[PDB]
Nucleic acid binder design. Structure first.
Lengths: 386, 63, 136
RNA sequence: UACUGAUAACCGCAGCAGGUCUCCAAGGUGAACAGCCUCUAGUUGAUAGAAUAAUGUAGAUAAGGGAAGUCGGCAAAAUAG
RNA sequence: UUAGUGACGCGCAUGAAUGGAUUAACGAGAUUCCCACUGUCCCUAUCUACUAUCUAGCGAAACCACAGCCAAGGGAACGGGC
RNA sequence: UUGUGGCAGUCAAGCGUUCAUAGCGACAUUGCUUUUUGAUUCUUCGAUGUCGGCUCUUCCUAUCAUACCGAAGCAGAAUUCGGUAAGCGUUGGAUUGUUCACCCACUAAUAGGGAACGUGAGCUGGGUUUAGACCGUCGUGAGACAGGUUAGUUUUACCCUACUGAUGAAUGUUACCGCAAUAGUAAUUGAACUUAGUACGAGAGGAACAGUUCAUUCGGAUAAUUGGUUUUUGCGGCUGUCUGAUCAGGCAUUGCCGCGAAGCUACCAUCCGCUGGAUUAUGGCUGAACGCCUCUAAGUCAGAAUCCAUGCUAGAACGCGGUGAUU
């Protein structure tokens, strides 16, 4: 017999299975569409989610009521030290898909990245890539031909890069490593560009620019084994109910005499791969610079790191990003940035953004002061201030 | 933009941070924090509360 | 709103569901307004339609004049008592929740208003602006 | 004519949260051998250790509204001297 | 408002100690409405102790043709088996 | 099985100002469905837990709305009929145990149904459905009444499967980077301004596409802000009592209050939610048969909430590749 009063599917089934990811570093499924008219350049980036904060700016959409008025917006901050390019691989295409035929690395490597190759590093000979360097230590002994092979073949190229987890304030010492597709120019140009960029930093001033809409790709925060009621948004059953109300009551009919997949069920919430899009960048900023927190309107020399620091992160002394809104992922976590796939204009992706003020107050409480100068000014001296 | 002054503590209210209250007599109060808000709802006197600017300036401290 | 939506509205946090009694602010004879419906309301299962500031509604009078009592009438909210958030992030709330009788088009059957109102309603319903003492 | 007189000596198949007649009965609070703390006397027994997911059991609080829930204000709150 | 109350009464089949009609007070009685109150609810969230959980040790029971993947078919007309 | 219930056809006397067919369509008639109710008694009486609601998924379409279209006794608006279409959605309440019905109101619209009349080791137990009891009628009486009322124990999963999540031997070892078979899939609807008081219309009244800003529903994240929560038993205070008094503390099943960070969390907060191709219906291009003509027969264009891809989720644990170091 039919459902007496209608209502929709609780939850979304495209996002199934709701299971723990394969990694703490979300796979980038898809990059943009390669084009040759442009120059060779990256199409992605890596950083570490630091936290959120709040800003002020003057909206401009001709027809709103806050047109040419102030707003206040929640932004999310990423610490993006420049990634060390080492290596590239070549993907030839088959009816069975793209396929790597070669992975060319660089001669010299950092302890962080070969640590990522290792697990127990403190008891190790640190024997890695030595015979690769000895394939190096000559002009081109067994490298030039791999490169020219990649030139003769390999419709697609992906550059291997790694992060600077020691530049971060974290406590890992184990670099993150990944690939990025290049979507510019020709293949020979891509590979020689990468050869030039072996062992070399690359930075966000080169990959991105303000008022660009992007995708944030990351793994969403783990919440353990969880009931159906938070995991799906199901109605709490009523008070008088023997044996539990944080449940689904019927989980299927007599026939088919099975539990349908679409029914809700308890289990893992979080640590899930997610790919959110259309996150306008509001500011690139520099580690090797002060006044990161200061707009043209404020001009009070102050960086972005609030008083007492980011909660669970620390400081932003590297190059960093401020993007509108939330993103998948929690603090201290990796994040994979990405150019869009589609030239969304919409009078929302083109809205040019200039900022006014940036909350640099303490998130470890309810902070009244953006600066200890301001603090001492408002308060006067103190007993400790001899 | 501008910054404002808690009715109770007399503190700068940077934009968004804090609550606002509009009594039936159209008096618009602002509160940096639920602390001040809750005291206000308790109908306390900041001149009697010690950490407040009013007590500070009424006892002539930081002159 | 719909009909008398002089422009649009931004969402406001919702605190006045059906069953809510809210004060009447105007000079129409009333004392209270029992909300029973909302215009432009959403249709979801075992969800109570909730009113807002500016939301026209259908209401009844449980207390007041026997010409107004025992019949529905359109009414408009001007006060909410539920902290909502404007685009400048200011979280603001009144102490009370009230409204005013109207016609379907939005013109107050009453000729005045007793207290403060919301700038959203004042910008969306011009007759309320006309009969407004103070706005915020 | 010892001893227990009961969350182990009695009856409940048992070292069962049950049942089984009575005497004595301190101090303070407070109307009160109420409830709460203490003195004398008596006990420190009941498998324990590590973590703290769901679902539960027992206890609680929750903005705005206020029974719209439901067979039904069931339960809980509010009131309380 | 199929409820509740007040009236009407060709009452299928009301009715006088097979007791009728009221009836203050009383009721862990049945029922309706109003005030208050509220996580009953919109719409869920959070916290605590005991569990479950893992361990050491102890260590049952119900039930059991054989066992345990679906669809259609036909079939004792709704199969785990064909 | 389908009388009966329901649904759809054939024919066309007539209605429709005139005209059978725009729309309806009596008398007659052919079928379908099993959501009624009968009829039957095949299974089931060494028991298949028996109405409804709640919850929750999935399916059909005889499509209520939404997408695109055709016809009109369609000037416009509004409406009616019909096609592809079940992608997507289909409410809150009053009374009733109710299914159903009837009203109120919003609504884009508030369509019908199935899954052992879905679902009780999922709830509840109003109702029905033991025993108590009351009334009425029937009965000489004990007692009877799908007649009315009231009160009346709702047991067990630790096994297998299914399901959700989670590990995992074996592939020469180990680590890293990848591919992507297959499966899943999602975004939905409305308003306002403008177009424009224009078109259209004698007048009355009264559009539309594009554009902009907003919202409804659903989803996926996040916790800067606000709110909540508070065993931070962090700070302060309060009562009773004990520690000779103070200082500082214990007990009060977390003693109570106010504040309360962190963390968790909320349409109670915020942010985001893609674009290309083939197609249906339909309208058409050339075009014969049928020396004309015809969207069709060969060929062919555009065309939808459709379909498939883009994209998104998992990654075959017996699918694969690249790379490093290999005692």
């Amino acid at each position: 017999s039919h459902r007496k009063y209608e209502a929709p599917r609780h939850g979304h089934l495209g996002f199934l299975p709701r299971k723990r990811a394969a990694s703490i570093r979300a796979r980038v499924k898809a990059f943009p569409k390669d084009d040759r008219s442009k120059p060779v350049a990256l199409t992605s980036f890596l950083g570490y989610k630091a936290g959120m904060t709040t800003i002020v700016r003057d909206l401009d959409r001709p027809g709103s009521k806050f047109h040419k008025r102030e707003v206040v917006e929640a932004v999310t901050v990423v610490d993006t030290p420049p990634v060390v390019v080492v290596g590239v691989v070549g993907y030839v295409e088959t009816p069975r898909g793209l396929r790597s035929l070669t992975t060319v690395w660089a001669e010299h490597l950092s302890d962080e990245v070969k640590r990522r190759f290792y697990k127990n590093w403190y008891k190790s000979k640190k024997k890695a890539f030595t015979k690769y360097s000895a394939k190096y230590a000559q002009d081109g002994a067994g490298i030039e031909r791999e490169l020219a092979r990649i030139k003769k073949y390999a419709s697609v190229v992906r550059v291997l890069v790694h992060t600077q987890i020691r530049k971060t304030p974290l406590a890992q010492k184990k670099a993150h490593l990944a690939e990025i597709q290049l979507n510019g120019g020709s293949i020979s140009e891509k590979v020689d560009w990468a050869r030039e960029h072996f062992e070399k930093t690359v930075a966000v001033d080169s990959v991105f620019e303000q008022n660009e809409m992007i995708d944030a790709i990351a793994v969403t925060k783990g919440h353990g084994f969880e009931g159906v009621t938070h995991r799906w948004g199901t109605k709490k059953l009523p008070r008088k109910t023997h044996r539990g109300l944080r449940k689904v009551a019927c989980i299927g009919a007599w026939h088919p005499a099975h539990v349908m997949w679409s029914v809700a069920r308890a289990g893992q919430r979080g640590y899930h791969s997610r790919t959110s899009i259309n996150h306008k960048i509001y500011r690139v900023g520099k580690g090797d610079d002060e006044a990161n927190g200061a707009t043209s309107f404020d001009r009070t020399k102050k960086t972005i790191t609030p008083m007492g620091g980011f909660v669970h992160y620390g400081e932003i002394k590297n190059d960093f990003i401020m993007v509108k809104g939330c993103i998948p992922g929690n603090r201290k976590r990796i994040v994979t940035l990405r150019k869009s796939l589609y030239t969304n204009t919409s009078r929302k992706a083109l809205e040019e953004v200039s900022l006014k003020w940036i909350d640099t107050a303490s998130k470890f409480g309810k902070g009244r002061f953006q600066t200890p100068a301001e603090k001492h000014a408002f308060m006067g001296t103190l007993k400790k201030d001899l | 933009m501008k910054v404002e002054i808690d009715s109770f503590s007399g503190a700068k209210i940077y934009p968004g941070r804090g609550t606002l209250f509009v009594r039936g007599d159209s008096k618009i109060f602002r509160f940096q924090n639920s602390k001040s808000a809750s005291l206000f709802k308790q109908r306390k006197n900041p001149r009697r509360i010690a950490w407040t600017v009013l007590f500070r300036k009424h006892h002539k401290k930081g002159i | 709103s719909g009909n008398g939506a002089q422009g649009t509205k931004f969402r406001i946090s919702l605190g006045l569901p059906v069953g809510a009694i809210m004060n009447c602010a105007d000079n129409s004879g009333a004392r209270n307004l029992y909300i029973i419906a909302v215009k432009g309301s959403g249709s979801r299962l075992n969800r109570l339609p909730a009113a807002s500031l500016g939301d026209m509604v259908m209401a009844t009078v449980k207390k007041g004049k026997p010409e107004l009592r025992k019949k529905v009438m359109p009414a408009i909210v001007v006060r909410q008592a539920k902290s909502w958030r404007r685009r400048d992030g200011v979280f603001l709330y009144f102490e009370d929740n009230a409204g005013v009788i109207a016609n379907p088009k939005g013109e107050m059957k009453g000729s005045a208003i007793t207290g403060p109102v919301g700038k959203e309603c004042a910008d969306l319903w011009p007759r309320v602006a006309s009969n407004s003492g103070v706005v915020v």
